[PDB]
C-alpha cells in the first residue's frame, strides 16, 4: 500500500540522459499530492489526460525524473530532430504516457541543484568506412548507447567522447558530443510517466 515518491525529493536530480526510473506495482497513489510541491509549468499527455492519469488503476506505473531547463521544452517532442528525443530520452509510443515540466520552489530545500544542465548533442557511430556516420538513437525506456562514454555531467560545452569498438561490438568507433545550459535561479525538472493496463493485476490504484 502507498506508492513512495520520496527518492525523487532527496538529493540532486540526474541529467536527462541519466534519468532515474521508479517502478510501481501494487500500491495506492496520490499524484496531485506530489505535484502540489512544485510550480507546474507544462503538463501534456499521450493516450491519456492529466485528469485520467491521476485517477486510474494500472498494472504498472513508471516514473522517470531528471533535471531539465524549461527553455528546451520543444526538444522533448519526437517531432523535429532534437538531440533530446534522438539521443537522450524517449518515452514509449506504445503505452500511455505523460510529460511534466516543473520548477522546484525556494521552499523546497531537500532537492539540491547541480552546476548546470547537461545533454547529449550527438551520438553517432563512425562506420568502419570511417567516412559514414550512423546516428545511435535512444530507444524507448532505454538509455543512450553513449551513456558509457559520457560523464554524468558534461564538462565543457562541445566536449567530445570516443570509444574504439571491438569486433564483437561491430568494430569502428562510437562518437558522442555534449552540450551544457546554465543553471537557473530555481532548478527546473522533467517527469515522464508511463502506465500499463491488463486483465487481472491493475493494483496501482489512486488512494481514496
Amino acid at each position: 500500500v502507498e506508492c513512495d515518491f520520496s527518492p525523487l525529493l532527496s538529493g540532486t536530480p540526474p541529467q536527462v540522459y541519466n534519468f532515474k526510473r521508479l517502478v510501481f506495482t501494487n500500491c495506492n497513489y496520490n499524484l496531485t499530492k506530489l505535484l502540489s510541491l512544485f510550480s507546474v509549468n507544462d503538463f501534456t499527455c499521450s493516450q491519456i489526460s492529466p485528469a485520467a492519469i491521476a485517477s486510474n488503476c494500472y498494472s504498472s506505473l513508471i516514473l522517470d525524473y531528471f533535471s531539465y531547463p524549461l527553455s528546451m521544452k520543444s526538444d522533448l517532442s519526437v517531432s523535429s530532430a532534437g538531440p533530446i528525443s534522438q539521443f537522450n530520452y524517449k518515452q514509449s509510443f506504445s503505452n500511455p504516457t505523460c510529460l511534466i515540466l516543473a520548477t522546484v520552489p525556494h521552499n523546497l530545500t531537500t532537492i539540491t541543484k547541480p552546476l548546470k544542465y547537461s545533454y547529449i548533442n550527438k551520438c553517432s557511430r563512425l562506420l568502419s568506412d570511417d567516412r559514414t556516420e550512423v546516428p545511435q538513437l535512444v530507444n524507448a525506456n532505454q538509455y543512450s548507447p553513449c551513456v558509457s562514454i559520457v560523464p554524468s555531467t558534461v564538462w565543457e560545452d562541445g566536449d567530445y567522447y570516443r570509444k574504439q569498438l571491438s569486433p564483437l561490438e561491430g568494430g569502428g568507433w562510437l562518437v558522442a558530443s555534449g552540450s551544457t545550459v546554465a543553471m537557473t535561479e530555481q532548478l527546473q525538472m522533467g517527469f515522464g510517466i508511463t502506465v500499463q493496463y491488463g486483465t487481472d493485476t491493475n493494483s496501482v490504484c489512486p488512494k481514496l
Partner: antibody, heavy 112, light 109 residues
Framework: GVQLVESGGGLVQPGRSLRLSCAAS????????MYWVRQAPGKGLEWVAL????????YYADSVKGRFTISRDNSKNTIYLQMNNLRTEDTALYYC?????WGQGTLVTVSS | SVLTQSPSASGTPGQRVTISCSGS????????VYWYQQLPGTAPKLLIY???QRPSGVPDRFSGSKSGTSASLAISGLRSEDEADYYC???????????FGGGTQLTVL
C-alpha cells in the same frame, strides 16, 4: 526489410572444399561487419569466422583456422565462406547473419 | 577463453529467472556481452545488444546485467513461449575471435 539468405549447402567430400554465399538486402551492406556461425545436428552454436565490413581484418576460430577463408563483395552485397579441408566436425547448419538480423541457414553435410 | 553457461533453467509462468554467463577478462569485462534466443526449429534472434540494450521489438521483460567476470539475463513474467535455448556471446581480443556459451535450455512449465 533486412533479409539474409544462405546458399551453397549440400554434400561435399571431406577434405574437399565448399564455398557458401550470403545474399543480403534491406540495409547498407558495406556499412556492417559480418559473421559466420555453424550448428552441428542437435548441438549448440559455434562461431566460425569474421570479416570486417570492407574485407579488411578477418579472424577465425581455431577449429577453422587455416582451412576456412572469409570474404565478401560490397559491390555485390554478398558474403562468402570458402571452406577448405572440410571435416566431419564441419557438418552443420551454416548461418550468415550480421547480429541484429538473422537468416535461415544452409545445411552442410560431410561427404558423405 | 571460454564462456560458461548453465545448460538449463526452469520456472513457472509469472516467475522470474536469472541465467548466468561466466567468463574471463579477455572475453567479458572489456568487451560487451550479447544475448540470443533459439526457439525449436527456428533461426536465432537478437535479444540483448551492448550488455543491456533491447533492439526494436524486444519486450522490456528481458533485461541484461554485466559485472567484471560475469554477465546475466533476467527474465521477468515468464511465459510458455519463452521455452527455448539461450546463448551468451563475447570476444577474445587475444584469440581474435567470437566465443559462444554452452547455452541454457529454459523449460517453461
Amino acid at each position: 526489410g533486412v533479409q539474409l539468405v544462405e546458399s551453397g549447402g549440400g554434400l561435399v567430400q571431406p577434405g574437399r572444399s565448399l564455398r557458401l554465399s550470403c545474399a543480403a538486402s534491406g540495409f547498407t551492406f558495406s556499412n556492417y561487419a559480418m559473421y559466420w556461425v555453424r550448428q552441428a545436428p542437435g548441438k549448440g552454436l559455434e562461431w566460425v569466422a569474421l570479416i570486417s565490413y570492407d574485407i579488411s581484418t578477418d579472424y577465425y576460430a581455431d577449429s577453422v583456422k587455416g582451412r576456412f577463408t572469409i570474404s565478401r563483395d560490397n559491390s555485390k552485397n554478398t558474403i562468402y565462406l570458402q571452406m577448405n579441408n572440410l571435416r566431419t566436425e564441419d557438418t552443420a547448419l551454416y548461418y550468415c547473419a550480421g547480429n541484429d538480423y538473422w537468416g535461415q541457414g544452409t545445411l552442410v553435410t560431410v561427404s558423405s | 577463453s571460454v564462456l560458461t553457461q548453465s545448460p538449463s533453467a526452469s520456472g513457472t509462468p509469472g516467475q522470474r529467472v536469472t541465467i548466468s554467463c561466466s567468463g574471463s577478462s579477455s572475453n567479458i569485462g572489456n568487451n560487451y556481452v550479447y544475448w540470443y534466443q533459439q526457439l525449436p526449429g527456428t533461426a536465432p534472434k537478437l535479444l540483448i545488444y551492448w550488455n543491456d540494450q533491447r533492439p526494436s521489438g524486444v519486450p522490456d521483460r528481458f533485461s541484461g546485467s554485466k559485472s567484471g567476470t560475469s554477465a546475466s539475463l533476467a527474465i521477468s513474467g515468464l511465459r510458455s513461449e519463452d521455452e527455448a535455448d539461450y546463448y551468451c556471446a563475447a570476444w577474445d581480443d587475444s584469440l581474435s575471435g567470437a566465443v559462444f556459451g554452452g547455452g541454457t535450455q529454459l523449460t517453461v512449465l
